[PDB]
Design a protein around this ligand. Sequence first.
Ligand SMILES: [Cl-]
Ligand SMILES: [Cl-]
Ligand SMILES: [Cl-]
Ligand SMILES: [Cl-]
Ligand SMILES: [Cl-]
Ligand SMILES: [Cl-]
Ligand SMILES: [Cl-]
Ligand SMILES: [Cl-]
Ligand SMILES: [Cl-]
Ligand SMILES: [Cl-]
Ligand SMILES: [Cl-]
Ligand SMILES: [Cl-]
Ligand SMILES: [Cl-]
Ligand SMILES: [Cl-]
Ligand SMILES: [Cl-]
Ligand SMILES: [Cl-]
Ligand SMILES: [Cl-]
Ligand SMILES: [Cl-]
Ligand SMILES: [Cl-]
Ligand SMILES: [Cl-]
Ligand SMILES: [Cl-]
Ligand SMILES: [Cl-]
Ligand SMILES: [Cl-]
Ligand SMILES: [Cl-]
Ligand SMILES: [Mg+2]
Ligand SMILES: [Mg+2]
Ligand SMILES: [Mg+2]
Ligand SMILES: [Mg+2]
Ligand SMILES: [Mg+2]
Ligand SMILES: [Mg+2]
Ligand SMILES: [Mg+2]
Ligand SMILES: [Mg+2]
Ligand SMILES: [Mg+2]
Ligand SMILES: [Mg+2]
Ligand SMILES: [Mg+2]
Ligand SMILES: [Mg+2]
Ligand SMILES: [Mg+2]
Ligand SMILES: [Mg+2]
Ligand SMILES: [Mg+2]
Ligand SMILES: [Mg+2]
Ligand SMILES: [Mg+2]
Ligand SMILES: [Mg+2]
Ligand SMILES: [Mg+2]
Ligand SMILES: [Mg+2]
Ligand SMILES: [Mg+2]
Ligand SMILES: [Mg+2]
Ligand SMILES: [Mg+2]
Ligand SMILES: [Mg+2]
Ligand SMILES: [Mg+2]
Ligand SMILES: [Mg+2]
Ligand SMILES: [Mg+2]
Ligand SMILES: [Mg+2]
Ligand SMILES: [Mg+2]
Ligand SMILES: [Mg+2]
Ligand SMILES: [Mg+2]
Ligand SMILES: [Mg+2]
Ligand SMILES: [Mg+2]
Ligand SMILES: [Mg+2]
Ligand SMILES: [Mg+2]
Ligand SMILES: [Mg+2]
Ligand SMILES: [Mg+2]
Ligand SMILES: [Mg+2]
Ligand SMILES: [Mg+2]
Ligand SMILES: [Mg+2]
Ligand SMILES: [Mg+2]
Ligand SMILES: [Mg+2]
Ligand SMILES: [Mg+2]
Ligand SMILES: [Mg+2]
Ligand SMILES: [Mg+2]
Ligand SMILES: [Mg+2]
Lengths: 172, 172, 172, 172
Amino acid sequence: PSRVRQNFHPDSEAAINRQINLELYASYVYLSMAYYFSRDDVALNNFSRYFLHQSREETEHAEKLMRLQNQRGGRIRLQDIKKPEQDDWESGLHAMECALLLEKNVNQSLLELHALASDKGDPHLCDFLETYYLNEQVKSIKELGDHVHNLVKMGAPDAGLAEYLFDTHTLG
Amino acid sequence: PSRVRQNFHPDSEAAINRQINLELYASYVYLSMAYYFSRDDVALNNFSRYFLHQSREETEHAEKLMRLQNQRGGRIRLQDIKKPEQDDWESGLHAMECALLLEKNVNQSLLELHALASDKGDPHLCDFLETYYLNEQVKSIKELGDHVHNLVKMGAPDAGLAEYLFDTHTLG
Amino acid sequence: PSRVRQNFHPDSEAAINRQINLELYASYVYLSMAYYFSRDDVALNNFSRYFLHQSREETEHAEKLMRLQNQRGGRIRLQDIKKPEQDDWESGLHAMECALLLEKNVNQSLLELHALASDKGDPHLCDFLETYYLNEQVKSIKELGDHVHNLVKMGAPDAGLAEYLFDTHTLG
Amino acid sequence: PSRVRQNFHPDSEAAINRQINLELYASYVYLSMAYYFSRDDVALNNFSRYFLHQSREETEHAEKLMRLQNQRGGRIRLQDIKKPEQDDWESGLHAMECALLLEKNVNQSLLELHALASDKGDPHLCDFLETYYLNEQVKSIKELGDHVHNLVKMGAPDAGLAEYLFDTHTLG
Ligand SMILES: [Cl-]
Ligand SMILES: [Cl-]
Ligand SMILES: [Cl-]
Ligand SMILES: [Cl-]
Ligand SMILES: [Cl-]
Ligand SMILES: [Cl-]
Ligand SMILES: [Cl-]
Ligand SMILES: [Cl-]
Ligand SMILES: [Cl-]
Ligand SMILES: [Cl-]
Ligand SMILES: [Cl-]
Ligand SMILES: [Cl-]
Ligand SMILES: [Cl-]
Ligand SMILES: [Cl-]
Ligand SMILES: [Cl-]
Ligand SMILES: [Cl-]
Ligand SMILES: [Cl-]
Ligand SMILES: [Cl-]
Ligand SMILES: [Cl-]
Ligand SMILES: [Cl-]
Ligand SMILES: [Cl-]
Ligand SMILES: [Cl-]
Ligand SMILES: [Cl-]
Ligand SMILES: [Cl-]
Ligand SMILES: [Mg+2]
Ligand SMILES: [Mg+2]
Ligand SMILES: [Mg+2]
Ligand SMILES: [Mg+2]
Ligand SMILES: [Mg+2]
Ligand SMILES: [Mg+2]
Ligand SMILES: [Mg+2]
Ligand SMILES: [Mg+2]
Ligand SMILES: [Mg+2]
Ligand SMILES: [Mg+2]
Ligand SMILES: [Mg+2]
Ligand SMILES: [Mg+2]
Ligand SMILES: [Mg+2]
Ligand SMILES: [Mg+2]
Ligand SMILES: [Mg+2]
Ligand SMILES: [Mg+2]
Ligand SMILES: [Mg+2]
Ligand SMILES: [Mg+2]
Ligand SMILES: [Mg+2]
Ligand SMILES: [Mg+2]
Ligand SMILES: [Mg+2]
Ligand SMILES: [Mg+2]
Ligand SMILES: [Mg+2]
Ligand SMILES: [Mg+2]
Ligand SMILES: [Mg+2]
Ligand SMILES: [Mg+2]
Ligand SMILES: [Mg+2]
Ligand SMILES: [Mg+2]
Ligand SMILES: [Mg+2]
Ligand SMILES: [Mg+2]
Ligand SMILES: [Mg+2]
Ligand SMILES: [Mg+2]
Ligand SMILES: [Mg+2]
Ligand SMILES: [Mg+2]
Ligand SMILES: [Mg+2]
Ligand SMILES: [Mg+2]
Ligand SMILES: [Mg+2]
Ligand SMILES: [Mg+2]
Ligand SMILES: [Mg+2]
Ligand SMILES: [Mg+2]
Ligand SMILES: [Mg+2]
Ligand SMILES: [Mg+2]
Ligand SMILES: [Mg+2]
Ligand SMILES: [Mg+2]
Ligand SMILES: [Mg+2]
Ligand SMILES: [Mg+2]
């Protein structure tokens, strides 16, 4: 093994590689959403900026796991980054609801990773997830829930002023 | 009696202890309201901030009466702080209407305290109430009346944009 | 359930509501102590300031749990805040000893909450307690133990200079 | 009458002249105390400074009443300023206890003046007393009560370190 490797189970190494792919996938989904909102027939520039920011954060989530792999003496194994489920995200509300589902799916993956690290007696990996990932996910899910609630109450997507005003106020 | 006590009737001392409890109760009601508005299914962050500010002001109202008790040589007697009437405050409009009723009830208690201080020939206590409490209550009741009127006219709670826009403009 | 809720057991939600009440109770105990020390027949202004500061910290402990409840999609359920065990706290030493007992009781409640979160496989809640509560309690208990030791050694409460000098030096 | 005089009863004018004399008397008592504490066989320089400050405040209390008399169209009538009851004030504790008795006697005089102004339907004079005198007296009596309590508990006047340490800490 690597002369740095210590208390680092091969199953943990493999699960970190799968999580890297999921974070890169999330970045790509948010990039897709960002450029949907800058279409001439959508033109919600603060929705665009919001999702572009989220995309860049997901790349940093991927990089911190890649750094962890190297720190612990594992070997990064990259896989294809699947295209998102849609190019046409339909509305500001629909994109927010899809983001919320994505963030809960990423959270479930992180909770499974934490359970595996716990089973393998890897407190360093548990602390890493608890310090950089699990509260970030709770905050992200709460923010998206807030946004979905306001957009639904305002009458999105069919009420003509709702997404326009949410874009200016909340995302401005 | 306390070597500081002078012209301070036991009935005034007792009424000050009851007012301390009412101010602490008002703080708790406003704390409850603040955290209702930060629920994921309410998510009106400026309503939240408004009521949190009101909560902290009520604690200062309680503390100034506690200080008065000590200044005059009375003895503070604390009682349970009752839970608010609701955890679910229903809407921005309903919370504002409940706040308005609370502030008029607190005002009536202060007016009764002033009448008692007058009956007991306690001009220091009358001046204390007139300087720190009675105009504060008039201003608070007027502000809440303004807010209720605007929210009703805008169509709250059922008009989808009303509480959202009041939160951004008036409470922003 | 709330569209944000994930891996959040109803027993954890209920235990968080009980902890909120205990933090609000601790705030009230420390408020009582603060205003005992500003009585004309006690007049230890730095003891007063010390306990007032502790009171305000406990309100922030309550608020962070209220925020956690909302973040995780639980529902805050407030209860009466019981009055403290005493209005007359007897001496600087006695108040410090009562504070030490309170902080150990709050610590035991937090340790039980951590054990419950562990049993329910809630690493987010475990990390929250470990990050914001458990070391805060250890530091608070140690500080109060230091203060009790010095006051006992100095001869409090009966040695006429002891609480006066502790107030000026240690709490000044 | 004076072309300014309005709603100003001769009994109020006379009571203001008596209060002017009492404030000038209080200034003289505090001047006496200040210079007792700078004797070579007393030499408590912060007790001296404390009472000198109180003396100068009493002169300002006298001047504000003299200004009120002129503002309302009354005529100032000065009388002898009686010497204080003692040149030898015995101890720091005894001077503080005598100051406390003086301030309660001045407070009783002000409360009688307020009752007279009330009987004569003079709200300007009532407000003047409530704004500049009655809370000043409550604060002064409370401070002196605090000081007396600490000096008694510390063992003054017989405990050799008590007045020395109170002078350095509390009055420093
Ligand atoms: Cl290994
Ligand atoms: Cl592949
Ligand atoms: Cl693949
Ligand atoms: Cl472990
Ligand atoms: Cl909703
Ligand atoms: Cl607008
Ligand atoms: Cl009395
Ligand atoms: Cl009770
Ligand atoms: Cl009760
Ligand atoms: Cl009166
Ligand atoms: Cl209306
Ligand atoms: Cl605007
Ligand atoms: Cl759940
Ligand atoms: Cl209850
Ligand atoms: Cl209860
Ligand atoms: Cl766990
Ligand atoms: Cl000890
Ligand atoms: Cl010292
Ligand atoms: Cl006249
Ligand atoms: Cl004369
Ligand atoms: Cl004379
Ligand atoms: Cl009048
Ligand atoms: Cl005493
Ligand atoms: Cl020192
Ligand atoms: Mg080697
Ligand atoms: Mg391998
Ligand atoms: Mg995958
Ligand atoms: Mg753009
Ligand atoms: Mg991520
Ligand atoms: Mg494919
Ligand atoms: Mg384990
Ligand atoms: Mg950790
Ligand atoms: Mg953290
Ligand atoms: Mg995020
Ligand atoms: Mg906003
Ligand atoms: Mg006495
Ligand atoms: Mg009594
Ligand atoms: Mg009541
Ligand atoms: Mg907020
Ligand atoms: Mg109030
Ligand atoms: Mg009940
Ligand atoms: Mg009257
Ligand atoms: Mg009046
Ligand atoms: Mg007044
Ligand atoms: Mg005013
Ligand atoms: Mg107010
Ligand atoms: Mg406006
Ligand atoms: Mg849904
Ligand atoms: Mg339930
Ligand atoms: Mg409890
Ligand atoms: Mg103080
Ligand atoms: Mg606490
Ligand atoms: Mg009870
Ligand atoms: Mg476990
Ligand atoms: Mg752990
Ligand atoms: Mg942790
Ligand atoms: Mg820490
Ligand atoms: Mg602490
Ligand atoms: Mg020290
Ligand atoms: Mg003329
Ligand atoms: Mg005349
Ligand atoms: Mg006289
Ligand atoms: Mg000097
Ligand atoms: Mg005076
Ligand atoms: Mg004579
Ligand atoms: Mg009248
Ligand atoms: Mg007035
Ligand atoms: Mg005033
Ligand atoms: Mg004074
Ligand atoms: Mg001091």
